[PDB]
Amino acid sequence: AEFIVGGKYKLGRKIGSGSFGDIYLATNITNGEEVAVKLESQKARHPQLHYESKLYKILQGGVGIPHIRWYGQEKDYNVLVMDLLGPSLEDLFNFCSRRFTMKTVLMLADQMISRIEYVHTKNFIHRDIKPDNFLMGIGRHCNKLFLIDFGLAKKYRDNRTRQHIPYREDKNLTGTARYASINAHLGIEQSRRDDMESLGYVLMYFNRTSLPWQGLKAATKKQKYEKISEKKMSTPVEVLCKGFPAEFAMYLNYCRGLRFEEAPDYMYLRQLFRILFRTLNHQYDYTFDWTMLKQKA
Amino acid sequence: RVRTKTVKKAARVIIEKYYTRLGNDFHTNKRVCEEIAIIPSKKLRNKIAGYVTHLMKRIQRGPVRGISIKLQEEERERRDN
């Protein structure tokens, strides 16, 4: 009608906005399966969609990555169309009236540990990890988390010569500062260590359901980020998880002290998480809070 | 309205034959189209009278030498027969 993408997909309504585009819904006119649309304007400030296509075709095959459907250019735009996914973690955070339990956050922690394992075994970093960035599956994928939005992703290691991007200071905050690292705040080159520090930050966001530096206001954006930084060094590690198991605390201590060229033992983290999970006497039944409020209705 | 090819062709040949007996207004032209041409169609008769009237109101505004030599040429042709 008004617009057809790919010659066989009919566009629908907007569902959200991406880092470098807008997110729409679409229906395939050939078979009827529903797809998600990332559209961007061909003349803008950030032409990075082809790099996103390269990163999506690199990350194929493994769990936690939606499969690639199509990419093309449409008369004023470039559009990359992917498989449909469900809501992000912040949508479930809003639906549950701002409360998470121990079992659900350990499910989410294991899933994001697996996601970070996959992305660092595929030789790339994320740098914009947030609960909005991790989506949830649909259909039989209803128990599987998915990772999207490679717009701010970059290469952090080489396949042949085993070399990192050289360390250099004064890096701008590409992602959000609610879960940015101390090294990311200062301008230190982001690596895997800052990545699972951000995993620990979204973990404590899920646990405490609030941040002491959330909603902080200052003179400007740089002053806001700086103030969040010195109050982050001013905050002790153990006081962030008072009344909580020390697993998260020593996880933060372990991921804080990691070096640049080191290879962390993710099997150790998974082992510790599953030991805590079985010592609190729970099982992997995938009964989440959003799921049980769906059956309660 | 536009005019077809046969109307202007028949009008030109009827000028070239009988310019002498014509007039200046639609009345005399439709009268001489009645009494000179067969013209079974009254519609085409009105069209031919209107366009020869247009030809008249065009051509006596020109120089009189061409119309004059047309008169003695037509008189010579009539006197020859």
Partner: protein, 331 residues
């Protein structure tokens, strides 16, 4: 990819970067970047700061410019000498552009004008075009007209491909000249008309077209000078049927006659019959374009230069004396 962005130097630098610190403008940026201008010859770093200096410099820091014009003149002059000794293009081009902006906004000023002027004959087109446009913007934006006119005269008399270059200067700068320098320039121009080269002839006819088309005042051009240059231009009339220079010759003689009538109408009408006779003779050329051009030129002169003065002239008979006799002659 990064030139078409709004944040780039294409759009936003021209608007919001001029407001340095919230107030437009401060040359403390330039006052701080002397250290890169001195003892550093790194490409694409001098050129970029010269580009930004050229772009920001138009936003009128005029009393500050008048104050530290000496410091800027010395700094950009040593930049000129160093880059002439080194031989680069982009840094030289935008430093020419920013010196042009500074001289447009504002004894030593004559020296800065001479330094800006001396790089017209520089063989690189990017340097030469920038210098030419800068000199044209400085003069049209004058006490410096005599110096540049004498420089052009001496540059022509010294010299063959640069002749067309300062002829382009003359084409773009003849109206803003004093009368004696116009006379000397036209004498030198007819001196290079003594040569049979075609391109110099066409370009200097274009210079005459630009001179007479602007309709100069009495200070730039007098009526006696116009009559003399009209009588001097009759000696060429290329052959009969050349149609590239004859078109320009008719057009510049038409414009000169129009300007002469505009200055002093009776002398212009007196000089008209010779031009009308030559145009009538030139109507025997086999080219249709020159015939149409001669018809259009004589029609324009009849409508604009001959018609409104006929109430002043009055009726003409076979025994007329003044401009009426000239009207009878061209009839």
């Amino acid at each position: 990819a990064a030139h078409k962005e709004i944040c780039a130097v294409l759009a936003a630098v021209t608007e919001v970067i001029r407001s340095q610190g919230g107030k437009e403008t401060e040359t403390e940026y330039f006052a701080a970047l002397m250290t890169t201008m001195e003892a550093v010859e790194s490409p694409e770093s001098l050129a970029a700061v010269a580009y930004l200096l050229n772009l920001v410099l138009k936003r009128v820091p005029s009393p500050v410019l008048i104050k530290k014009f000496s410091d800027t003149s010395k700094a950009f002059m040593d930049i000129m000498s160093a880059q002439a000794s080194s031989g680069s293009t982009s840094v030289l081009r935008w430093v020419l552009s920013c010196l042009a902006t500074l001289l447009r906004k504002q004894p030593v000023t004559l020296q800065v004008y001479h330094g800006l002027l001396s790089f017209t004959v520089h063989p690189k087109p990017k340097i030469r075009k920038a210098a030419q446009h800068g000199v044209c913007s400085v003069l049209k934006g004058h006490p410096a007209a005599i110096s540049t006119a004498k420089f052009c005269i001496q540059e022509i008399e010294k010299s063959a491909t640069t002749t067309l270059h300062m002829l382009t200067l003359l084409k773009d700068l003849l109206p803003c000249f004093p009368e004696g320098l116009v006379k000397s320039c036209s004498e030198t121009l007819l001196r290079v008309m003594t040569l049979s080269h075609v391109l110099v002839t066409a370009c200097a006819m274009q210079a005459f077209h630009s001179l007479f088309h602007a309709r100069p005042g009495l200070s730039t051009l007098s009526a006696e000078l116009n009559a003399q240059i009209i009588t001097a231009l009759y000696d060429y009339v290329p052959s009969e049927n050349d149609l590239q220079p004859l078109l320009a010759w008719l057009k510049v003689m038409e414009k000169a006659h129009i300007n002469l009538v505009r200055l002093q109408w009776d002398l212009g009408l007196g000089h008209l019959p010779r031009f009308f006779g030559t145009a009538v003779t030139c109507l025997l050329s086999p080219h249709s374009q020159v015939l149409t051009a001669a018809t259009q030129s004589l029609k324009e002169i009849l409508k604009e230069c001959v018609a409104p003065h006929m109430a002043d002239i009055g009726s003409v008979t076979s025994s007329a004396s003044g401009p009426a006799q000239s009207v009878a002659k061209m009839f």
